[PDB]
Design a binder for this molecule. Structure first.
Ligand SMILES: NC(=O)C1=CN([C@@H]2O[C@H](COP(=O)(O)OP(=O)(O)OC[C@H]3O[C@@H](n4cnc5c(N)ncnc54)[C@H](OP(=O)(O)O)[C@@H]3O)[C@@H](O)[C@H]2O)C=CC1
Ligand SMILES: CCCCCCCCCCCCCC(=O)SCCNC(=O)CCNC(=O)[C@@H](O)C(C)(C)COP(=O)(O)O
Ligand code: SF4
Ligand code: SF4
Lengths: 144, 208, 44, 176, 156, 156, 96, 155, 94, 112
């Protein structure tokens, strides 16, 4: 019967995540216990998976790394953690993963992606980028 | 041929011109000028006293059954003595045509309300009074819509600045939202975009 | 060569656009007969 | 040209009357709606597992503005101020002076992300493809001031997202 | 210290309870309400995260100012904020609510909802995509997670 | 609203904004349709009929839904005309007026569709008209998909 | 979808329709995200000759409105337009 | 050290030039003092000890950038230094009506005010405002009043 | 990216808060966002192309992905011709 | 010239008197309903000041138009259309006093 097949598929999901401990790990971290083909992994540790059988919008997903840029991300994960190269593959902007089609290499491009830094000492602070317009007269230092 | 340019329909132009002459003949007491735009739109210019008579004539079938008030609005041109140009847009479903009636007024001269003839002009006249300074006589209930309850000025008037004169903020001392004089952090940058060269010679005004 | 997002040659397939609310269920006599029969059996 | 909704007369035959009496007494239509809801219960839910799963986007997506550079590394913007003119919300403030090298560069380029309407203008106006709304959308801030971007912030965003932005422009530059 | 440990664990518990069950109020003025509903729509359904729309301000915990805040609407917005029990957080959605957006120079628009009520998270966009709003809500949840109310109480 | 999300995806593909796009401009359209969009619109439209049918199943014949709307908000045709009503409000009362047929603006003269007309001028009749208008919009969408011309998307 | 046959039968019977044929969720039927590069056609005015802007200048062909009557200086009754023709009931489905 | 020319009409966006650090701004008097500074457009460098949530109500009082929230430690003097470093005026409102376990009446009325005054002088703060009840006196029976008088003399 | 006497990182614009200025307080517990890459240095580093024609055209690279095409005159031996947009430098050989 | 409501200045004065009467008697009800902290006398003094603001007008039509506006404001206050904020906007409490002597203006700013 198909019910037995579904139960066995659940058992295969348990095995594929590395055992019961990995199954519980992914269940608590991501709330999803699906097993998919590992397309690749960024330098920061985020792992990217693809399951074309699942309907559009769930065919691609990312398991965020437990540690990025000196922050423990085992429980606190955010979308900004995705590096730009994998961002377009994840959001379906392109069908080609960065491993297959690497981005063009430029010197000015950042080598380490930073997540949203709001609420942190690294937060951006606005300031004027122009010098003083009017220069005041400097009084002479001699008494007269 | 000439794909870019908009096609012209002369038949509708002739029909609108003939109907405009019809309206001009029927009520010469009020109509001052009737013109047909080359995009096939008919405008009848009326003395302010004729708003109710001519509109009632248009609604009732003297070969004209304009029974729906498209929109009612004003255009404030400060140069003219009657700075406000009251504009009526009507649609006739029987004849699948629309005509426009336009009249003028001052800040101090009331214009008769058209609530009786159309009944859709209640809120339109209220909006005209709230934005522009035009007062409609015999209106069932003339009060402000789209402005704050205590708003003093009349916006859309070409004199009212876009940012207004007052600004609202919450004040903890009085535990209430309080108005204050406007003080913009970034002044709206006025751009002078008009080109020094004439664009349309067809509309060249006489040198005088 | 020109390549714009164009309909496929011959156009797309027909697209259903009318109510297809199906006709389902037994006739009223049948429903009443079933109900009364169940009631009679229960009573017995 | 026109179709009549309603405007239908029920049959008065005994079978039809019995059917309608059955519908009223036996709540048939309510049961049909219930069955529809049950079927939707057994259908697969459409929820995506955000943030682990992201919603689809096209290359033309309009998000966080990002100043770009030439491959050499020189900043593309050439202080044309065309963006400030088209800006429909006046969220772009540009100040320029001849730099030491003598090139026409912007001493100040501020995009107030609190006044911008994400119209997509400027991206379509800049003659040198300088300001280009990036793919990023998740740049919420805890304070208002963080959303008043500066030229340094825009250039940092461009450097951060250039890998994706160049690819998106490459995807869409032929349509423009 | 043991007392500090107990206080820290209790604060973790209360912060987890508050961030897991965030009840935003059904408050949408302008266009951004549509994207808010799309967040409530099945694709990005907020109920998975514990986010449930509850009409009552007294039964609500977060106010999402989704839309242009006009001068006429501002006193009502302040009133509904005040009637909302604490802890209360405000999320500003849309350029219009953040700083006035397209209608910043309008006579009838309050240039940002920060002027009327304090704001915790600003969601840029016009309209902010529903994913951006969900991201802002999760950022608010992390902000709650970082709160140290009981720790500060113990340090006094 | 799931279908609404898909239509927002179509908006995003053409213009880059899920809503409030600047696609339609004086002189035409800003950018031509990205390759592959039209067939995706075909895929969406071929199944949208089942969704709208399911909505009718939930609401059209429900006793409660009829009781809430069968005779509320009745407007006389002459009163509707005088008060300036337009669209369904007019057509619900039974007057036959649709600007798409009476005064076609762009290419509606080259498409075939039926204007839904009501008979009792109530909320339920307006509901019926809105649902039918959706169906006729699906028909118009099929027609437009089949006969999209090749060429420029903005005035030369 | 990935539903078992039993669940498919149950959902279809509850609907009264075959849900499997038309599934709201999207699968491989969607168009590929990456598409071959496009080549958009030029318009009518992309010509090297006989393309003087004077001929195709739409704006300069507009004129101020013609004044039919001005106060400041038998005949058959006329209407703004011919009366509208009565609409005809649709052939495809006259009554919903 | 930090002289600012007043500009504007004295409104919310105007620059009054009074860069101030209102200690105890979250207080009953602080709620109003900060409000007035903001409505004058005075840059207020608010030092806080509590959670930012409690300080959130002070945010609307000033315009964008006018109100800066910086955590300070009551005992540590470097926090006082960093919070008065660029201030031309420092206001001392650090009063606790009741006496806490960690902080006694002396701690909050002598050490803290004296530390603030001294560090303000080190940074070059032009003007300092201190608050002590009229009843507070060097012989006043209430311990907190006596500490307030001592702190006043030390300030 | 040089450092001002106050310790701030001077911007490519040359912006740095003076010790007297009170606006430095905004970075007290936060950071001043400065882009380390400076356009002037990078444009200087690029080698000068040598072309044997009196007039050359720079599109900035990538065709439509660059900047409007301009033609640069290289007659002057003393000074290299510089693209107004790209900033690349060209000169005739010898 | 077409009269709005009065053909002469006297008739406009009569209408002004009626409007003043109505505002005067409404003031205590406004104080009670809106829970304002001002006294009835204070509100009536503000009413008197507002009425004297328009005293210099010497045209009957302008007087009539002002009366119409006054009637609309009174209808708003009689209903609860205006909030407590709107009612207190007459009392410019938050706004700081603006000195009027030349020397103070010279000190404060460049404004004429
Ligand atoms: N009737 C009155 O109000 C009178 C007031 N005063 C003085 O006026 C000042 C302000 O009054 P008011 O605002 O009403 O007082 P509050 O008690 O309401 O607030 C005083 C402020 O002191 C701060 N504070 C207290 N202890 C410490 C500490 N150990 N470290 C850091 N901050 C601390 C509080 O911050 P937090 O809340 O976070 O602890 C609070 O902001 C006080 O100095 C008070 O003694 C004197 C005479 C009369
Ligand atoms: C809270 C209190 C709110 C107060 C609000 C009261 C109002 O709305 S004020 C509106 C009243 N305006 C007028 O009456 C206009 C009168 N115009 C005039 O010209 C008159 O002064 C006259 C005609 C010269 C007569 O002046 P006297 O009353 O004789 O001198
Ligand atoms: S997208 Fe924003 S910044 Fe760019 S032009 Fe439009 S309003 Fe201005
Ligand atoms: S930010 Fe944009 S979408 Fe949101 S309310 Fe303002 S105009 Fe509407």
């Amino acid at each position: 019967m198909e019910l037995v097949q579904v139960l066995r598929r659940g058992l295969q999901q348990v095995s594929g995540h590395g055992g019961l401990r990995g199954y519980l790990r992914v269940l608590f971290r991501a709330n999803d216990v699906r097993v998919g083909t590992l397309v690749g992994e960024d330098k920061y540790g985020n792992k990217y998976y693809e399951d074309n059988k699942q309907f559009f919008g769930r065919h691609r997903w990312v398991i965020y790394t437990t540690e990025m840029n000196g922050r423990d991300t085992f429980w606190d994960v955010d979308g900004s953690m995705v590096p730009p190269e994998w961002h377009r593959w994840l959001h379906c902007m392109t069908d080609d993963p960065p491993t297959t089609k690497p981005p063009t290499a430029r010197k000015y491009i950042w080598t380490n992606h930073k997540f949203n830094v709001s609420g942190t000492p690294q937060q951006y602070v606005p300031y004027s980028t122009t010098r003083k317009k009017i220069q005041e007269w400097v009084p002479p230092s001699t008494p007269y | 041929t000439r794909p870019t340019i908009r096609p012209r329909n002369d038949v509708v132009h002739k029909q609108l011109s003939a109907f405009g002459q019809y309206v001009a003949e029927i009520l010469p007491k009020y109509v001052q000028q009737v013109q047909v735009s080359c995009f096939n739109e008919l405008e009848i210019f009326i003395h302010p006293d004729g708003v109710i008579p001519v509109l009632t004539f248009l609604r009732d079938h003297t070969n004209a059954q304009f029974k729906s008030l498209a929109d009612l609005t004003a255009v404030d041109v400060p140069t003219r003595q009657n700075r406000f140009e009251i504009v009526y847009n009507l649609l006739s479903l029987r004849f699948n045509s629309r005509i426009r009636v336009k009249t003028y007024t001052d800040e101090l001269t009331p214009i008769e309300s058209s609530v009786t003839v159309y009944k859709a002009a209640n809120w339109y006249e209220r909006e005209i009074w709230d934005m522009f300074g035009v007062f409609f006589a015999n209106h069932p209930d003339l009060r402000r819509i789209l402005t704050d309850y205590g708003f003093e000025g009349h916006p859309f008037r070409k004199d009212f600045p876009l940012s207004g004169y007052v600004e609202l903020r919450y004040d903890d001392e009085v535990k209430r939202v309080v108005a204050e004089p406007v003080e913009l952090a970034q002044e709206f940058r006025k751009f002078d975009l008009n080109s020094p060269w004439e664009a349309f010679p067809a509309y060249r005004q006489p040198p005088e | 060569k020109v390549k714009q997002d164009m309909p496929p040659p011959g156009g797309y397939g027909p697209i259903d656009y009318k109510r297809n609310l199906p006709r389902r269920g037994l006739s009223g006599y049948s429903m009443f007969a079933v109900g009364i029969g169940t009631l009679l059996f229960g009573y017995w | 040209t026109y179709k009549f909704v309603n405007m239908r007369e029920p049959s008065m035959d005994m079978k039809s009357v019995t059917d309608r009496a059955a519908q009223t007494l036996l709540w048939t239509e309510l049961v049909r709606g219930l069955g529809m809801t049950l079927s939707y219960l057994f259908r697969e839910p459409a929820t995506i597992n955000y943030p682990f799963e992201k919603g689809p986007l096209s290359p033309r997506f309009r998000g966080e503005h990002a100043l770009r550079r030439y491959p050499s590394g020189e900043e593309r913007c050439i202080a044309c101020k065309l963006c400030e003119a088209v800006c429909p919300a006046q969220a772009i403030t540009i100040e320029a002076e001849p730099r030491a090298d003598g090139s026409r560069r912007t001493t100040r380029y501020d995009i107030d992300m609190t006044k911008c309407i994400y119209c997509g203008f400027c991206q379509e106006a800049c003659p040198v493809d300088a300001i280009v709304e990036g793919p990023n959308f998740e740049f919420s801030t805890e304070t208002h001031e963080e959303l008043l971007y500066n030229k340094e912030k825009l250039l940092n965003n461009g450097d951060k997202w250039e890998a994706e932005i160049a690819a998106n422009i490459q995807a869409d530059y032929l349509y423009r | 210290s043991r007392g500090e440990y107990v206080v820290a664990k209790l604060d973790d518990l209360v912060n987890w309870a508050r961030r897991s069950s965030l009840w935003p109020m059904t408050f949408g003025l302008a266009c951004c309400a549509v994207e808010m509903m799309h967040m409530a729509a099945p694709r990005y359904d907020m109920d998975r995260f514990g986010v449930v729309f509850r009409a009552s301000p007294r039964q609500s915990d977060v106010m999402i100012v989704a839309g242009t805040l006009t001068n006429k609407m501002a006193p009502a917005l302040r009133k509904v904020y005040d009637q909302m029990p604490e802890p209360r957080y405000v999320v500003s959605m849309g350029s219009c609510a953040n700083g006035g957006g397209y209608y910043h120079y309008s006579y009838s628009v309050v240039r940002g909802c920060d002027r009327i009520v304090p704001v915790d998270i600003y969601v840029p966009g016009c309209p902010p995509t529903a994913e951006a709003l969900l991201y802002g809500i999760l950022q608010l949840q992390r902000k709650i997670k970082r709160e140290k109310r009981l720790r500060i109480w113990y340090r006094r | 609203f799931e279908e609404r999300e898909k239509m927002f995806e179509f908006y995003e593909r053409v213009s880059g904004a899920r809503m409030h796009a600047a696609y339609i401009r004086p002189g035409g359209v800003h950018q031509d349709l990205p390759l592959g969009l039209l067939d995706d619109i075909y895929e969406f439209s071929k199944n949208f009929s089942f969704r709208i049918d399911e909505l009718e199943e939930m609401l059209t014949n429900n006793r409660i839904w009829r009781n809430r709307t069968v005779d509320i908000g009745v407007v006389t045709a002459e009163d509707a005309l005088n008060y300036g009503f337009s669209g369904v409000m007019l057509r619900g009362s039974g007057i036959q007026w649709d600007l798409r047929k009476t005064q076609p603006y762009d290419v509606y003269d080259q498409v075939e569709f039926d204007v839904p007309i009501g008979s009792r001028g109530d909320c339920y009749d307006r509901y019926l008209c809105r649902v039918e208008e959706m169906r006729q919009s699906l028909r118009i969408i099929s027609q437009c998909l089949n006969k999209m011309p090749p060429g420029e998307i903005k005035v030369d | 979808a990935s539903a078992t046959r039993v669940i498919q039968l149950l959902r279809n019977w509850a609907s009264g329709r075959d849900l499997q044929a038309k599934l709201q969720l999207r699968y491989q039927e969607i168009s590929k995200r990456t598409q071959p590069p496009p080549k958009l056609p030029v318009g009518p005015s992309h010509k090297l000759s006989n393309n003087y802007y004077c001929t195709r200048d739409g704006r300069r062909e507009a004129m101020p409105p013609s004044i039919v009557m001005s106060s400041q200086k038998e005949k058959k009754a006329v209407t703004p337009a011919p009366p509208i023709k009565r609409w005809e009931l649709s052939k495809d489905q006259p009554y919903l | 050290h930090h002289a600012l020319i007043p500009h504007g009409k004295g409104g919310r966006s105007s620059v009054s030039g009074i860069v101030a650090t209102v200690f105890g701004a979250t207080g009953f008097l602080g709620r109003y003092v900060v409000n007035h500074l903001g409505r004058m457009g005075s840059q207020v460098i608010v030092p806080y000890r509590c959670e930012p949530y409690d300080t959130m109500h002070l945010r609307p009082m000033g315009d964008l950038g006018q109100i800066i929230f910086m955590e300070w430690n009551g005992k540590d003097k470097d926090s006082i230094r960093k919070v008065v470093e660029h201030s031309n005026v420092v206001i001392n409102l650090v009063g606790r009506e009741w006496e806490t376990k960690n902080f006694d009446f002396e701690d909050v009325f002598v050490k803290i005010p004296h530390a603030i005054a001294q560090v303000s002088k080190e940074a070059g703060v032009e003007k300092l405002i201190h608050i002590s009840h009229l009843n507070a006196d060097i012989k006043s029976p209430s311990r907190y009043l006596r500490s307030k008088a001592v702190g006043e003399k030390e300030v | 990216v040089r450092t001002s006497p106050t310790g701030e990182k001077v911007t490519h614009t040359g912006q740095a808060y003076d010790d007297g200025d009170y606006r430095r307080v905004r970075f007290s517990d936060r950071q001043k966002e400065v882009n380390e890459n400076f356009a002037i240095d990078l444009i200087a580093e690029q080698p000068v192309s040598e072309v044997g024609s009196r007039v050359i055209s720079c599109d900035g690279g990538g065709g439509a992905l660059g900047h409007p095409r301009v033609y640069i005159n290289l007659d002057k031996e003393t000074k290299t011709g510089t693209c107004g947009y790209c900033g690349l430098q060209f000169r005739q050989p010898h | 010239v077409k009269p709005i409501f009065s053909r002469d200045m006297n008739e406009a004065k009569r209408r002004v008197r009626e409007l003043y009467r109505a505002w005067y008697r409404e003031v205590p009800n406004t104080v009670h309903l809106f829970q304002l902290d001002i006294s009835v006398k204070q509100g009536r003094d503000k009413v008197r000041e507002m009425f004297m603001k328009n005293a210099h007008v010497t045209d009957p039509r302008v007087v009539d138009l002002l009366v119409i506006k006054g009637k609309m404001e009174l209808e708003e206050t009689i209903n609860v259309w205006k909030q407590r904020t709107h009612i207190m906007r007459f009392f410019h409490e938050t706004e700081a006093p603006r000195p009027t002597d030349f020397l103070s203006k010279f000190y404060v700013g460049h404004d004429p």
